[PDB]
């Protein structure tokens, strides 16, 4: 019976927001891992299932309600409960097939989607690249309204693919990177909507390759560059840990520490 | 268990076509694209693709190389005009994949040589 985070974009407001991200931080690492000053998530191998997984419990003004399942090795969303009926991104491996057997072991309904949470395949099905997809508490409100009605026959799975796009990277994405949760902030405090720009969806595509840079780093120093880009989509280049300490808030595991 | 593979001397000012395909538990496959490495000096992004149909492209082969991507075959081609004795480098296919994150694996191909002037 994992813990569960709620949050509510009813009222919501930036320091509800964050006090909300910040406990999604706390539950998924203990801080035993931290390196370079950044937290390392929990290594999958060894992690026993009854620490796999952390329930985030998401409701809006309608006060219609799903709960997100997110696994502690990567902080992605990989499935959710609405109502009876329980739902599952197809898991890369065997071993992660069997752990997602233990999650809403209550409801009638468990399925296994067809494809997994993986962007190219989001983007297709909603037929839009994130960088055209709104993010906010606007938007938030609405994939959380889309989650529910689709274990109600309600809404289609282009509609369902840009809500996951949404919920993924303002919580999964807002959780891995201080900068991402700052975007967040920034809308929300204004009350806006809008798309993220290349400086957040070049960071949503490199969280593995930076995690791997940074752990089998030089003292920070990467053995070969990662490409970035800044908000206007002009190329870069980053090289050490020490300027992605602001950036960065959660790595997923790659190596073992160097003692 | 994903491989990667590279079909494809030339003259400056010349054409030319790379292609790389994908197979084996390449589900959640995300980006594709081709680096380049001209010795002693460093690996640099060229163009990458993603099967949603977002290009990046080094600034320094804009308007001269095209990079396109066929998701039925799962494999991704560069066109390379106007080809200068600055772009003869190894150069090198990659493939990033994950059900959850962009790039859970980060799989290089062996690289193809290529010559100019």
């Known amino acids: 019976q994992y813990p569960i985070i709620n949050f509510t974009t009813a009222g919501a407001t930036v320091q509800s927001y964050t006090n909300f991200i910040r406990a999604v931080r706390g539950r998924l690492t203990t801080g035993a891992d931290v390196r370079h000053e950044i937290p390392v998530l929990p290594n999958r191998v060894g992690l026993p299932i009854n620490q796999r997984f952390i329930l985030v419990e998401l409701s809006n003004h309608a006060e219609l309600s799903v709960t997100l399942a997110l696994d502690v090795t990567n902080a992605y969303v990989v499935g959710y409960r609405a109502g009876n009926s329980a739902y599952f991104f197809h898991p890369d491996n065997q071993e992660d097939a069997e752990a997602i057997t233990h999650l809403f072991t209550d409801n009638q309904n468990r399925y296994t989607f067809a494809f997994g949470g993986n962007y190219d395949r989001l983007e297709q099905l909603a037929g839009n690249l994130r960088e055209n997809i709104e993010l906010g508490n606007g938007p938030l409100e609405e994939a959380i309204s889309a989650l529910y009605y689709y274990s109600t026959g309600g809404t289609q799975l282009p509609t369902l693919a840009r809500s996951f796009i949404i919920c993924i990277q303002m919580i999964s994405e807002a959780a891995r990177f201080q900068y991402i949760e700052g975007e967040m902030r920034t809308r929300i405090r204004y009350n806006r909507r809008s798309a993220p720009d290349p400086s957040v969806i070049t960071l949503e595509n490199s969280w593995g390759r930076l995690s791997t840079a940074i752990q089998e780093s030089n003292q920070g120093a990467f053995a070969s560059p990662i490409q970035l880009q800044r908000r206007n989509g002009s190329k870069f280049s980053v090289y050490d840990v020490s300027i992605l300490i602001p950036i960065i808030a959660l790595m997923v595991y790659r190596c073992a520490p160097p003692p | 268990q994903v491989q990667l593979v590279e079909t494809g001397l030339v003259q400056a000012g010349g054409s030319l076509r790379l292609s790389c395909a994908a197979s084996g538990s390449i589900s959640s496959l995300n980006a594709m694209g081709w680096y380049r490495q001209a010795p002693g000096k460093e690996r640099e992004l060229v163009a990458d693709?993603?099967?949603?149909?977002?290009?990046n492209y080094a600034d320094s082969v804009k308007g001269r190389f095209t990079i396109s991507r066929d998701n039925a075959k799962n494999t991704v081609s560069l066109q390379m005009n106007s080809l200068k004795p600055e772009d003869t480098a190894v150069y090198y296919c990659?493939?990033?994949?994950?059900?959850?994150?962009?790039?859970?694996?980060?799989?290089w191909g062996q690289g193809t040589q290529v010559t100019v002037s």
């Open positions: 990659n493939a990033v994949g994950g059900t959850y994150y962009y790039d859970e694996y980060d799989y």
């Open positions: 693709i993603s099967a949603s149909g977002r290009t």
